[PDB]
Amino acid sequence: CTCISISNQPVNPRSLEKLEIIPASQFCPRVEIIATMKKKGEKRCLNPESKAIKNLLKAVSK
Amino acid sequence: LSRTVRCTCISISNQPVNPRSLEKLEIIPASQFCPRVEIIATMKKKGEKRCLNPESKAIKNLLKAVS
Amino acid sequence: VRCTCISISNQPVNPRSLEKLEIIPASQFCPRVEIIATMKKKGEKRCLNPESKAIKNLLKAVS
Amino acid sequence: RCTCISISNQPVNPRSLEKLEIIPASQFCPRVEIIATMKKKGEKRCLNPESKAIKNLLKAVS
């Protein structure tokens, strides 16, 4: 897929420009949570398993 | 200061979306370029881009649903 | 469709802060050319003047 | 991680283009990319930033 490497690193919501979620397609057996950081626009993936993701979305809501 | 450009969504839809029909989904929290969160649903069919109303209680379950 | 540009800046673009640059030719619900530039920092967008020449340069300087 | 996997070779009618975007070589994708969004069925297509045509096409669409 798009992630060459998933990250277990925490990401502070307030540093999120746009969070992207791409459910398992027909040519990518697995979920993909790509975060796009503000500064520099750093793009890194997120381990779908990690627990903080299980609430990072609820965060980017307000 | 005042913002130069507009937000990405002309309209936000209250209609719910079946998680399995989503091909993508992206949350874009506010900024001083679009002072409000825009939830964009990218459907599988006709690569259409429908925006979802973050207010809709519907667009609060669709996220856990995708993972 | 609509025109995303509320404004257009005559300021010069940091050819190296240019995260991404879009060129939306004139449509129907937006009868004009819009040149949007997203700067890396914060990923903030800024419209550029398509009549200006800063474009002949910048645009070319980005390929 | 890059957006463009395989840049296209065949010419894009300078008018039949709905939107064009340039992403200069970044710390997240070593190469200057050019995605041509097509009106009809809004297909997406990576152009070849080298074809002398492109250099001119980016000019024409302004």
Is some CB atom of chain C closer than 8 A to the CB atom of B3? yes
CB contact set of A62 (below 8 Å; sequence gap of 6+): B29, B30, B37
Range of the domain at A36: 1-62
- CA-to-CA distance for D46 and C40, rounded, in angstroms? 21
A53 and A33 in contact (C-beta within 8 Å)? yes
Is some CB atom of chain A closer than 8 A to the CB atom of D5? no
Picking from A20, A23, A61, the nearest residue to B26 by CB comes out as A20
Work out the burial of residue C62: count CB atoms within 10 Å of its CB; fewer than 13 is exposed, 13-18 middle, 19 or more buried.
buried
Q: What is the CA angle A50-B49-C44, rounded to 5?
A: 70
Q: What is the DSSP string of A3-53?
A: -SS-------GGGEEEEEE---BTTBSS--EEEEESGGG-EEEE-TTSTGG
- CA-to-CA distance for C47 and D6, rounded, in angstroms? 29
Nearest to A54 by CA among B64, C60, C31: B64
Contact state of D24 with C18 under an 8 Å Cβ cutoff: yes
Is some CB atom of chain A closer than 8 A to the CB atom of D24? no
C38 and C45 in contact (C-beta within 8 Å)? yes
Identify how the structure was determined: X-ray
- CA-to-CA distance for C56 and C48, rounded, in angstroms? 12
C52 and C31 in contact (C-beta within 8 Å)? no
Mutate to test the interface with C, among B2, B3, B5, B51 (most CBs of C within 10 A): B5
Q: Which two tokens stand for residue D47?
A: 């152009």
- CA-to-CA distance for A32 and A46, rounded, in angstroms? 7
Q: Which two tokens stand for residue C61?
A: 């300087």
- CA-to-CA distance for D37 and C50, rounded, in angstroms? 19
- CA-to-CA distance for A46 and A44, rounded, in angstroms? 7
Cα D62 to Cα A37, C26, D35: the distances in Å are 30, 9, 16
| Residue D33: strand pairing partners | D23
Is some CB atom of chain C closer than 8 A to the CB atom of B4? yes
* Beta strands at B26-28 and A43-46: parallel, antiparallel or unpaired: unpaired
Give D37→chain C minimum CA distance, Å: 10
- CA-to-CA distance for A28 and A59, rounded, in angstroms? 27
The sheet with strand D44-47 has its strands ordered as C45-48, C34-39, C18-24, D17-23, D33-38, D44-47
* Beta strands at C45-48 and C34-39: parallel, antiparallel or unpaired: antiparallel
Phi–psi pair at B32, nearest 5 degrees: -95, 50
Query: Hey, what amino acid is at A26?
Result: Q
Neighbours of chain D (3+ CB pairs under 8 A): A, C
In total, how many domains does chain C have? Answer: 1
- CA-to-CA distance for B10 and D19, rounded, in angstroms? 18
Contact state of B29 with A21 under an 8 Å Cβ cutoff: no
Residue count (chain A): 62
CATH, residue A29: 2.40.50.40
Contact state of B63 with A62 under an 8 Å Cβ cutoff: no
Mutate to test the interface with D, among C8, C19, C22, C41 (most CBs of D within 10 A): C22
Q: What is the DSSP string of D26-41?
A: BTTBSS-EEEEEESGG
Nearest to D20 by CA among D2, C1, D62: D62
Cα A50 to Cα A45, B20, B27, D2: the distances in Å are 12, 22, 18, 24
